[PDB]
Structures are given as structure tokens and as C-alpha cells.
Write an enzyme that holds these catalytic residues in place. Structure first.
Site, mmCIF file in Angstrom:
data_model
loop_
_atom_site.group_PDB
_atom_site.id
_atom_site.type_symbol
_atom_site.label_atom_id
_atom_site.label_comp_id
_atom_site.label_asym_id
_atom_site.label_seq_id
_atom_site.Cartn_x
_atom_site.Cartn_y
_atom_site.Cartn_z
ATOM 1 N N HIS B 43 0.812 -1.252 0.000
ATOM 2 C CA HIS B 43 0.000 0.000 0.000
ATOM 3 C C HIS B 43 0.807 1.245 0.000
ATOM 4 O O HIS B 43 0.267 2.310 -0.083
ATOM 5 C CB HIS B 43 -0.976 0.077 1.177
ATOM 6 C CG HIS B 43 -0.347 0.301 2.516
ATOM 7 N ND1 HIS B 43 0.277 -0.592 3.205
ATOM 8 C CD2 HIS B 43 -0.312 1.439 3.254
ATOM 9 C CE1 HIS B 43 0.692 -0.084 4.320
ATOM 10 N NE2 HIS B 43 0.338 1.174 4.376
ATOM 11 N N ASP B 99 -0.035 -7.573 2.227
ATOM 12 C CA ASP B 99 0.480 -6.205 1.961
ATOM 13 C C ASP B 99 1.969 -6.416 1.694
ATOM 14 O O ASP B 99 2.807 -6.175 2.547
ATOM 15 C CB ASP B 99 0.154 -5.366 3.265
ATOM 16 C CG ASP B 99 0.260 -3.865 3.052
ATOM 17 O OD1 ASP B 99 0.527 -3.502 1.906
ATOM 18 O OD2 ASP B 99 0.055 -3.147 4.031
ATOM 19 N N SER B 198 5.522 2.610 7.562
ATOM 20 C CA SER B 198 4.975 1.498 6.699
ATOM 21 C C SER B 198 6.003 0.931 5.738
ATOM 22 O O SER B 198 6.774 1.702 5.210
ATOM 23 C CB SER B 198 3.768 1.998 5.846
ATOM 24 O OG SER B 198 3.045 2.842 6.730
HETATM 25 ZN ZN LIG Z 1 0.697 2.865 5.958
#
Ligand SMILES: [Zn+2]
Ligand code: NA
Ligand SMILES: [Zn+2]
Lengths: 11, 252, 36
Positions: B43, B99, B198
Site C-alpha cells: 500500500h 500487503d 509502513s
Molecule cells: Zn501505511
């Protein structure tokens, strides 16, 4: 906020 | 990283920074697994709900960094991407299940004291280290609070949480391709990943062979360090065959 | 890259390779009910 990076890495 | 401290030089040699050419801004974190492949969270690159869809040409990979905003001349290396691969079943419509994404760099990077890849776990190692109570480490140049950005790479060591407790902390469907980590409100210890982290790695040091393995990827959370919540990570071992495939199908 | 890494993966030039520990690894190893 970031510092200029050596033009060559964008091209 | 909320309630995490500055790292040391050479502490996380595998930590990568994904940079955007224009505006020149930090985007996500990633890790180096071989001299040509970087691993991040999908993402970070594709998220339709907010119209995000980056391509090779819009990113830069900075490796060997410590400081967030400075071009550490002679210490870091900057590479371009050749290809980005997302997991074909990445689920952005529901819970960011799978992910994971792989990026192939144009040319191989040379290692140094500051650049070195991390290992990817094998069934036995996963089995022995992914246990509740075992702490793992996460690093990044992300936000320091939910609502305040660090000058150097931050670290934080978090315990892994028991799936049921992970599950009862949210209304999102947790799959077997995710695990959660963090301290219970009762443990009076804090820390978490936050916006900007992330894609980075969650690694553990093997007490058998003194090596660092990447067990997870920073994936999602509900805020940063809220009491009662935990952060979720992608389960690298459960998606390892995928990894192998693209690598021995598209290079090394 | 693949299983167990790449070969020379996981050992840090400034720590493992020099037998130097970083200030918080102890914490991890201890959580796996202690390692030696
Ligand atoms: Zn994120
Ligand atoms: Na929390
Ligand atoms: Zn958020």
C-alpha cells in the site's frame, strides 16, 4: 525539509 | 516511531528509505534482501481509495541513511527501480491482506558497513521465533506522535501479541497473513510504528545463529500507540514462496 | 533473497562481525526466555 540530492539521480 | 529512540550507526543496515522525486518527500520504508531486491508494503505504492499508484519512475531508493533529511554524501547510495511487483492478491478493498511488494533495482548495490541485507526466515526459524512475548524490532523515519518528525532513524522493540487478543482489539478481519505486536495497556511500556514507517521491517535476532531475520513488514494500525490497539504487520514467511517465485522468475 | 536470507545476510559489519552488541538487542534475546 529534505536537502537537495545530486541531480544525476532524477534524470 | 512513537516512544522509540534514535538508532545507532550500522544498527539497521538493511533499512531502506523510498523517496519521491517531486515533491522530494519521504514516502515509506523498506528493507534490502539481496543486492538487487528491496521489499516494502504494497500500500505504500498502490492505494486506490486515495488515488495512490506510483510507478518506477516516481520513486528513488536511499540506502545507508541515518539522518532523514540530509544527503549523507559518501555514506548512502541512491538507486532507481527497474520493476515493482505487487502481490496479485493484495486486498486493498478490505483489510490490506497480503500487503507485500518487491522492487527490482536498476543495478546491484555494493554493501558496506552501512549497507547489508537481512535474512528471510525459513520454516524452522519462523516456528521458533514468532511466539507471543518475544520482542522484535521496527525502525523508520516516521512520525513521532499521532499528532514531531525525527532527525535520525528510530527504533523500538515490541512484543508479539496473541492472535485472539489482536483480534479482539479491532473490527477488521485479521487473516493468517498478518500478526500484531505492541504492549498491553497493563504492561506500562509503549511504542508503535506510525505514519512514515509502513514498509519497513520487523526483524528478530536468532539466538541460534546470531542473525537478524525479517519476520514482518509494517502494515497498518488504528492511530499510533493508542492504548488498547496494536500494529499489524505482514507475515513474511507466509508469503515467502511468492517472494522466491518472482525472484527466481525475474532475476536475483 | 530466499530461505535463511542471502548467505551473508543478517550479520552487521559494525556489530556481529566485530562481536559488538547494540544497546537493546539484549532485550530481544532475553524475551526468548533468555539466550546464551
Ligand atoms: Zn501505511
Ligand atoms: Na497500543
Ligand atoms: Zn494511520
Amino acid at each position: 525539509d529534505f536537502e537537495e540530492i545530486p541531480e544525476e539521480y532524477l534524470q | 516511531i512513537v516512544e522509540g529512540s534514535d538508532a545507532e550507526i550500522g544498527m539497521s543496515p538493511w533499512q531502506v528509505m523510498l523517496f519521491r522525486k517531486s515533491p522530494q518527500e519521504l514516502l515509506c520504508g523498506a528493507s534490502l534482501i539481496s543486492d538487487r531486491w528491496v521489499l516494502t508494503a504494497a500500500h505504500c505504492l498502490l492505494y486506490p481509495p486515495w488515488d495512490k499508484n506510483f510507478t518506477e519512475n516516481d520513486l528513488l531508493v536511499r540506502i545507508g541513511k541515518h539522518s532523514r533529511t540530509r544527503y549523507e554524501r559518501n555514506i548512502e547510495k541512491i538507486s532507481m527501480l527497474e520493476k515493482i511487483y505487487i502481490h496479485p492478491r493484495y486486498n486493498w478493498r478490505e483489510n490490506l491482506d497480503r500487503d507485500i511488494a518487491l522492487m527490482k533495482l536498476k543495478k546491484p548495490v555494493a554493501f558496506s558497513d552501512y549497507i547489508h541485507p537481512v535474512c528471510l526466515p525459513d520454516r524452522e526459524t519462523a516456528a521458533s521465533l514468532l511466539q507471543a512475548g518475544y520482542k522484535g524490532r521496527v525502525t523508520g523515519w516516521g512520525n513521532l506522535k499521532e499528532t514531531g518528525q525525527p532527525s535520525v532513524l528510530q527504533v523500538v522493540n515490541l512484543p508479539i501479541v496473541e492472535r485472539p487478543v489482536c483480534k479482539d482489539s479491532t473490527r477488521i478481519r485479521i487473516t493468517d497473513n498478518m500478526f500484531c505486536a505492541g504492549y498491553k495497556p497493563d504492561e506500562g511500556k509503549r511504542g508503535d510504528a506510525c505514519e512514515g514507517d509502513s514498509g519497513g521491517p520487523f526483524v528478530m535476532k536468532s539466538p541460534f545463529n546470531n542473525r537478524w531475520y525479517q519476520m514482518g513488514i509494517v502494515s497498518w494500525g488504528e492511530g499510533c500507540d493508542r492504548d488498547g490497539k496494536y500494529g499489524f504487520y505482514t507475515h513474511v514467511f507466509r508469503l515467502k514462496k511468492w517472494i522466491q517465485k518472482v525472484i527466481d522468475q525475474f532475476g536475483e | 533473497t530466499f530461505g535463511s536470507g542471502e548467505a551473508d545476510c543478517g550479520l552487521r559489519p559494525l556489530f556481529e562481525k566485530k562481536s559488538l552488541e547494540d544497546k537493546t538487542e539484549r532485550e530481544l534475546l532475553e524475551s526468548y526466555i533468555d539466550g546464551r
